[PDB]
Amino acid sequence: MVALSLKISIGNVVKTMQFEPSTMVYDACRMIRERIPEALAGPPNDFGLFLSDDDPKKGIWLEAGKALDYYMLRNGDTMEYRKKQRPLKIRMLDGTVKTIMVDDSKTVTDMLMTICARIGITNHDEYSLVRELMEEKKDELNWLDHGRTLREQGVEEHETLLLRRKFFYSDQNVDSRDPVQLNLLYVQARDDILNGSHPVSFDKACEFAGFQCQIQFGPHNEQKHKAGFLDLKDFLPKEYVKQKGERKIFQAHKNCGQMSEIEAKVRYVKLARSLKTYGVSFFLVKEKMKGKNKLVPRLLGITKECVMRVDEKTKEVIQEWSLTNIKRWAASPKSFTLDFGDYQDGYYSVQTTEGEQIAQLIAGYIDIIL
Template sequence: MVKNNSSTIMNGNNHTSEHMITLNIHIPHDNVIHSMQFDIQMLINDICYNIQQHLLMTIDHDLSEYGLFINDAQHSVRSYWLDPTKTLNYYALKNEDHVEYKNRYRPLKIRLLDGTVKTILIDDSLIVAQLMVYICTKFGIANYDEYSLVYDIDTDDSINNTKTATLLRDRSLQRTDKKMEELRKKCHTDDDTLWLDQSKTLRQQNIDEQSTVILRRKYFFSDTNIDQRDPVQLNLLYVQCRNAIIDGTHPVTYDEAIQFSGLQCQIQFGDYEESKHKPGIIDIRDFLPKEYAKTKNVEKRIFLEHKKHIGLSELDGKVKYTQLCRSLRTYGVTFFLVKEKMSGKNKLVPRLLGVTKDSVVRVDERTKDFIQVWPLTHVKRWTASPNTFTLDFGDYASAYYSVQTHEGQQISQLIAGYIDIILKKRKDREDKTAGNDIVDEEATMIEDIIAPGKATIIEPNCPSFDHVHQKNVYSPPIIRGTFSDSTNHSDHQQQGNYFSSQIYEQAKSLSNNQHSNDGTMLFSTIENARNTTYTVQSQLARELQ
């Protein structure tokens, strides 16, 4: 490495030394270091421009792709890119600190659920939430906010063992119950899925050029609209459904398992041919859950089911498979194994806590039967601590629902993610409706005669003028990352930070309006009854006379 000791002053005129800082600019491409002096009030973007103008570099790439990078060789997760919109003073840099000037773009290996691995160039300075827009666009996926990245443990080798150990360390240290661990594996929960934090960069999560990540659907919200017109998302959804059926994430009966495997044969092999499709040509473990793999004559049953789908195309088969999978009650549920207090006893028992696009559910850990369902609109707020997760249902329940778990942050992020998507979709619909809702002042007006008993008094709802009434209808989208730092929890406080649900308040408001309308209808009904009674009494009186 060559070091150039000459110092270049950038924007140093009329500034005292206290406003200046000397940095060692390392250019990895040329393997040289230049000592340069900068004004601490300069924007990072301007510093990059000055570096480009004053240093001779053999770079043949677009210089707009370059940026400043703080490289911590001992702790790579502490390495970070300097934001072009920030000033140098924003960062706690000292004189003679080393800063790398290099290309922000680097390759990232992404594995799809069908096993294919694709390598794309990504901007290493962006957080995962921003990268998802680019990655999904690259793969032709529209609903980028429903997908996320998972660290691929299967591709981990001896070089990366330390990395995997770091990612899993916190969870493994917290878990000491062997029975719970065995049950967790059997239930195929989301506890050990290493979802990347969307509020951090890949570099901050130790994902480097050698790492592989998996592109997976995390939120099952708009997947019902996926059909033949979107073959990319259809294939991703089909593979995720197929894997969940085979590994037991979705419990199915024997007959249902045969239905799924017959469709899978049609998708993979095409039309049934008696001379070709005979017992012994398929690996049953790739088509059936393991509890049915050794059933007698099961392969014949599969081919009989396969025969029913002659003429069905691959795309139509995938649509039918995903539709059949959606009919399962466990579809779209993300499960977490927790411990809850047994009713009437001071004892904790295992339970599955599930999160869907519209509800939170308590599920039997053995059969995956639903025990209790709470709509998301009933969730007023929730809190996650290192060892517990608590739900507050406001007026819909008399007590909190609290469980013991080390996955509180994951559950919290999942609920917040679904609420974020709901609010975003709702706002999009409202904006679209508002755009089409043009009032025509010359529109025809129809006058209707209303009976007194059916009339409703309409009054302006004017607040008192000495108070300003302000209500937040919609907040900016949430970046689904770490919502609270475990270091913020004190020893005497079990709860973490509370997160309030906006859809709870909206649902509550709608409910109150409904009750108000119900009251108006009730009074109208009473008034109608009184009028009818009075009319009948008058008629009887006249007849008696």
């Protein structure tokens, strides 16, 4: 009977109450409900005991099943008999915001389970809550620890959380569950694009740059991802740095929303592999103009199946031939020539220093069939 004298705060009321240090929090609550009428303003499950801190993130709810002495309580400490139920704004998959009363003492996981049940979602484990704006000044990331509470993470009641389904994708090429292999595919594809080995359009370069932003900086932040934030040399093929790509790139970045790094790498790779130019060995050549002294720069591509003539600026395939249409080919130290015989009127000849390299490649590919 070495009683604990605790100040009980309910609204404007302060009553000092005696408890044995072994008293259970649930019993302490009952004792308060029998003495202070203010304590009866709602059901016992809507209230709890709370130990405040100047830092709201450091305030703690007592667990019903614990004893008061677990919380290292001492004579003269104040305990607040406070309402647990708070509002939580959640952005739905359809973009609408639903406000729901949640128990501030519960974990993010427990709130997500409550959320799913109210909107009729069959598996809460396929979803997560994300932050709208992560406070950079604090250690508050866009990612939320689903084992910790909203209070301890500094999620203020006027803050919205987004409902997002967990991303999963796989095929013969890529698997979202193997981030190692996915990173190998990503880096290769990215590097080919940035160094011009894989020629793409300006519009595509800006899409690839938007994903690259998403991967390297996370979701677009308008307050941080401003004019001159990007070193465009690192995000675009050199030939597109001249152009005002930043506006285009920031819109592509913005269009990604709160897409995970994994999803952005998967989308990058799948987008790179979708282009006709993917896996094509390109040579920058020059075309002679009959009766003129100008030459027209062009991109010549080679694959096991075909030869393509691609516009150097737009990267449009303006012609293509099957490797099986080649009748003869011939190289010199200043030019390369293709003969398609019946499958075209005139040879296709271009000015190039790498004619032997081109011819070597074609020889190799022709070697397999017949």
